[PDB]
């Protein structure tokens, strides 16, 4: 006896979850960086406004 | 088939996480592009200043 | 084997969406770094001219 299709489906789901976990953490990091860069750019323009 | 059922559940878990990751990555791209445009504006103001 | 086959297909979908989300996240990280560096150029130029 063998449960091969189910075993392979389970391995595929575990692999997919590892990939998706890593993508989530990468994406959240990228969001933080992107907002920090937006704030840095805004601050540069703010300093120029204030110096007008 | 208990293993197949659990594999199905775990695949839905993976989809929920991948969908959230995609949403967040799309927002990060849009914000980073906005940051590039705004930073270019500050440098253009500098280039063209009196 | 319908259930296992469905779980496998759903897992493949999640896996592919996760790969694209990781690529998009890197693209945003790259753009954010460029914007960060350009904002620092802008400030530098402004302080040198002030």
Swiss-Prot record, chain A:
Transmembrane segments: none
First-listed, main subcellular location of the protein, grouped into a coarse class: membrane
Key words of the record: Cell outer membrane, Cell wall, Coiled coil, Formylation, Lipoprotein, Membrane, Palmitate, Peptidoglycan-anchor, Repeat, Secreted, Signal
Sequence repeat spans: 3-13, 17-27
GO CC field: cell outer membrane; extracellular region; membrane; outer membrane-bounded periplasmic space
Coiled coil (residue ranges): 6-52
Gene disruption phenotype: Double lpp-ompA mutants are spherical and only grow in the presence of electrolytes such as 30 mM Mg(2+), and are sensitive to hydrophobic antibiotics and detergents. The peptidoglycan layer is no longer attached to the cell outer membrane which undergoes abundant blebbing.
GO annotation terms (biological process): lipid modification; periplasmic space organization
Gene Ontology MF term list: identical protein binding; lipid binding; peptidoglycan binding
Effect of residue 49 to E/G/S: Does not affect the formation of murein-bound lipoprotein
Topology term for the membrane: Lipid-anchor; Peptidoglycan-anchor
Miscellaneous notes: About one-third of Lpp is covalently bound to peptidoglycan.
Subunit (UniProt): Homotrimer. Interacts with OmpA. Has been isolated from outer membrane preparations as an approximately 87 kDa complex, suggesting it also forms larger complexes. Seems to interact with TolB, Pal and TonB. In pull-down experiments interacts with CedA.
Official protein name in the record: Major outer membrane lipoprotein Lpp
Covered residues, full protein: 22 to 73 of 78
């Amino acid at each position: 006896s063998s449960n091969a299709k189910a075993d392979q489906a389970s391995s595929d789901a575990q692999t997919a979850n590892a990939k998706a976990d890593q993508a989530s953490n990468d994406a959240n990091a990228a969001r933080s960086d992107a907002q920090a860069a937006k704030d840095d750019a805004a601050r540069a323009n703010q300093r120029a406004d204030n110096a007008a």
